Write an enzyme that holds these catalytic residues in place. Structure first.
Site, mmCIF file in Angstrom:
data_model
loop_
_atom_site.group_PDB
_atom_site.id
_atom_site.type_symbol
_atom_site.label_atom_id
_atom_site.label_comp_id
_atom_site.label_asym_id
_atom_site.label_seq_id
_atom_site.Cartn_x
_atom_site.Cartn_y
_atom_site.Cartn_z
ATOM 1 N N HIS A 1 0.975 -1.109 -0.047
ATOM 2 C CA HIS A 1 0.026 0.354 -0.077
ATOM 3 C C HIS A 1 0.950 1.405 -0.103
ATOM 4 C CE1 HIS A 1 -3.654 -2.132 1.920
ATOM 5 N NE2 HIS A 1 -3.773 -2.201 0.464
ATOM 6 N N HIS B 1 -0.445 -8.715 0.986
ATOM 7 C CA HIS B 1 -1.523 -9.050 1.991
ATOM 8 C C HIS B 1 -2.133 -10.161 1.926
ATOM 9 C CE1 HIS B 1 -1.106 -4.677 0.317
ATOM 10 N NE2 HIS B 1 -0.924 -4.613 1.673
ATOM 11 N N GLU C 1 -6.097 -8.002 3.953
ATOM 12 C CA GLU C 1 -5.435 -9.038 4.903
ATOM 13 C C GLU C 1 -6.584 -9.838 5.336
ATOM 14 O OE1 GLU C 1 -2.607 -10.036 8.499
ATOM 15 O OE2 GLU C 1 -2.767 -7.882 7.944
ATOM 16 N N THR D 1 -1.933 -8.263 11.048
ATOM 17 C CA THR D 1 -0.414 -8.136 11.287
ATOM 18 C C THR D 1 0.098 -6.910 11.609
ATOM 19 O OG1 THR D 1 0.115 -7.948 9.196
ATOM 20 C CG2 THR D 1 0.429 -10.101 9.831
ATOM 21 N N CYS E 1 3.017 -8.422 13.578
ATOM 22 C CA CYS E 1 4.472 -8.696 13.197
ATOM 23 C C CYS E 1 5.442 -8.021 13.842
ATOM 24 C CB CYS E 1 4.532 -8.702 11.655
ATOM 25 S SG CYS E 1 4.481 -6.886 10.957
ATOM 26 N N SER F 1 -2.401 2.732 3.662
ATOM 27 C CA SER F 1 -1.732 2.039 4.538
ATOM 28 C C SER F 1 -2.242 1.875 5.927
ATOM 29 C CB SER F 1 -0.098 2.435 4.505
ATOM 30 O OG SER F 1 0.802 1.637 5.392
ATOM 31 N N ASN G 1 -0.907 -0.043 8.575
ATOM 32 C CA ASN G 1 0.240 0.078 9.665
ATOM 33 C C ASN G 1 0.799 1.647 9.812
ATOM 34 O OD1 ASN G 1 3.341 0.414 8.405
ATOM 35 N ND2 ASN G 1 2.090 -0.650 6.814
HETATM 36 O O1 2E7 Z 1 -2.366 -1.526 4.899
HETATM 37 P P1 2E7 Z 1 -1.222 -2.367 5.421
HETATM 38 O O2 2E7 Z 1 -1.720 -3.826 5.721
HETATM 39 O O3 2E7 Z 1 -0.351 -1.768 6.534
HETATM 40 O O4 2E7 Z 1 -0.170 -2.765 4.154
HETATM 41 P P2 2E7 Z 1 1.201 -1.913 3.741
HETATM 42 O O5 2E7 Z 1 1.042 -0.911 3.760
HETATM 43 O O6 2E7 Z 1 1.341 -2.848 2.181
HETATM 44 O O7 2E7 Z 1 2.323 -2.605 4.736
HETATM 45 C C1 2E7 Z 1 3.027 -3.774 4.322
HETATM 46 C C2 2E7 Z 1 2.316 -4.895 4.782
HETATM 47 C C3 2E7 Z 1 1.972 -5.789 3.801
HETATM 48 C C4 2E7 Z 1 1.337 -6.938 4.027
HETATM 49 C C5 2E7 Z 1 0.525 -6.913 4.996
HETATM 50 CL CL1 2E7 Z 1 -0.429 -8.287 5.613
HETATM 51 N N1 2E7 Z 1 0.801 -5.948 6.212
HETATM 52 C C6 2E7 Z 1 1.589 -4.870 5.976
HETATM 53 S S1 F3S Z 2 3.244 -8.782 8.196
HETATM 54 FE FE1 F3S Z 2 5.296 -8.724 6.593
HETATM 55 S S2 F3S Z 2 4.597 -7.442 4.790
HETATM 56 FE FE2 F3S Z 2 5.698 -6.124 6.511
HETATM 57 S S3 F3S Z 2 4.227 -5.120 7.932
HETATM 58 FE FE3 F3S Z 2 4.639 -7.317 8.631
HETATM 59 S S4 F3S Z 2 6.680 -8.189 7.865
#
Ligand code: 2E7
Ligand code: F3S
Length: 309
Positions: free
Chosen positions: A41, A74, A126, A167, A197, A225, A227
Site C-alpha cells: 500500500h 496482503h 489481509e 499483522t 508482526c 496503509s 500500519n
Molecule cells: O495496509 P497495510 O496492511 O499496513 O499494508 P502495507 O502498507 O502494504 O504494509 C506492508 C504490509 C503488507 C502486507 C500486510 Cl498483511 N501488512 C503490511
Molecule cells: S506482515 Fe509482513 S509485509 Fe511487513 S508489515 Fe509485517 S513484515
C-alpha cells in the site's frame, strides 16, 4: 529546528520481498506482469511498478489467459487462489511469510470444525485473505475490531475456540481486545500475545520514543496503509500533531512554523527515498541535519522464490 528520525522505520522484510518478486518477474518475463491488488500500500511503489509495465487489477477475471499473475503481500483467500489455479495462469505469490503463518492456523481450525475469531478491520485485504482460509460450515469464522464487538459476539461452541490477528494492528488496542476475548471466552486459545508482526511492533515502539521528543511527527506512507495510520494515531494520542504524508509536497508550512523539534518516520511500505526528500523539505523550512534515534536492531530478510532469482 531539530529533525529526528525514528528507528526502525520504512521497509520491512515482507515489503522488500514482495517488491523484488514483481521487479524480478518483470526483468525475467518482460511486461506485462499482472498483480492482484496494490502489491503493497504505497502509491510511489505502485506508480513506479505501473510505469515499468506491472498491471494492477482487483479481480482475476480482469487478467487475460496465459499471463503471469502475482498475489500481493496482503495475501489472498482460498477462493481467489483456486480461481487462479483453475485458469491458464502462471502464479507467483508475494504474500508475506508472516501472513501465511496466520493463514495456516485459520486453515487448521477450519479442518477441525472449530470456530475462530479474527481481530482486524472490516474490508482490509489481509482480513479478506485470512477469513477466506476458513471454509467449514460446521465451525465458523468471526471478525471483531473492538471490545464492544467481543461483548456482542455469540459462538456455537465456546469450549473449542481460537483467535488470530491482523499483522498491522495497534499493539495497545489489540491488547484491550484480547483481554475482552479472555473474559468473555475463558477457554479461548491463541498465540502467546498476538499475530502482530515484528515490523509493526518495532515501528510503533519507535514512533513512541520519537513522539516523546518531537512536537510534530510526520509519517511517510499512503492513506490506505493500515500500519502507517497506526503510527500517526499513536503519535496523536500522545498529544502530538501527526500527519500521514505520501511525499514532501504534502508538507504544509504551518505544520512546522515555530516548531523546535520535528520527528519523521515511515510505514513498512514507504521507500527511503521519500523520507530523504521529506528531510530535504524540512531543511528548506529551517531544519538542521537529520538525527537518527537509536533503535532496536532488525535483522530479518525474506528471500524471493528461487525461480525469481
Ligand atoms: O495496509 P497495510 O496492511 O499496513 O499494508 P502495507 O502498507 O502494504 O504494509 C506492508 C504490509 C503488507 C502486507 C500486510 Cl498483511 N501488512 C503490511
Ligand atoms: S506482515 Fe509482513 S509485509 Fe511487513 S508489515 Fe509485517 S513484515
Amino acid at each position: 529546528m531539530q529533525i529526528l528520525l525514528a528507528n526502525p522505520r520504512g521497509f520491512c522484510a515482507g515489503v522488500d520481498r514482495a517488491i523484488s518478486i514483481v521487479e524480478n518477474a518483470l526483468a525475467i518475463y518482460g511486461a506485462p506482469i499482472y498483480v492482484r491488488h496494490e502489491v503493497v500500500h504505497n502509491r510511489y511503489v505502485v506508480d513506479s511498478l505501473r510505469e515499468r509495465g506491472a498491471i494492477f487489477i482487483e479481480q482475476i477475471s480482469e487478467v487475460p489467459d496465459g499471463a503471469i499473475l502475482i498475489f500481493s503481500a496482503h495475501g489472498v483467500s482460498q477462493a481467489v487462489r483456486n480461481e487462479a489455479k483453475s485458469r491458464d495462469l502462471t502464479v507467483f505469490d508475494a504474500t508475506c511469510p508472516l501472513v501465511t503463518k496466520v493463514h495456516m492456523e485459520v486453515a487448521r481450525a477450519s479442518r477441525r470444525g472449530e470456530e475462530s475469531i479474527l481481530i482486524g478491520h472490516a474490508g482490509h485485504p489481509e482480513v479478506e485473505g485470512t477469513m477466506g482460509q476458513y471454509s467449514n460450515p460446521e465451525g465458523g469464522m468471526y471478525l471483531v475490531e473492538s471490545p464492544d464487538d467481543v461483548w456482542k459476539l455469540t459462538v456455537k461452541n465456546e469450549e473449542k475456540l481460537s483467535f488470530m490477528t491482523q499483522t498491522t494492528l495497534s499493539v495497545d488496542d489489540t491488547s484491550d481486545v484480547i483481554d475482552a476475548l479472555r473474559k468473555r471466552f475463558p477457554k479461548i486459545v491463541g498465540p502467546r500475545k498476538d499475530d502482530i508482526c515484528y515490523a509493526t511492533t518495532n515501528r510503533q515502539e519507535a514512533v513512541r520514543a520519537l513522539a516523546e521528543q518531537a512536537e510534530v511527527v510526520l509519517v511517510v506512507g499512503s492513506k490506505n496503509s493500515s500500519n502507517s495510520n497506526r503510527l500517526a494515531e499513536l503519535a496523536q494520542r500522545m498529544g502530538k500533531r501527526a500527519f500521514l504524508i505520501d511525499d514532501a509536497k504534502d508538507i504544509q508550512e504551518e505544520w512546522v512554523k515555530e516548531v523546535k523539534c520535528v520527528g519523521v518516520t515511515a510505514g513498512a511500505s514507504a521507500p527511503d527515498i521519500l523520507v530523504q526528500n521529506v528531510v530535504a523539505r524540512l531543511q528548506q523550512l529551517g531544519g538542521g541535519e537529520a538525527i537518527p534515534l537509536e533503535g532496536r536492531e532488525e535483522n530479518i530478510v525474506f528471500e524471493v522464490p528461487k525461480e525469481l532469482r
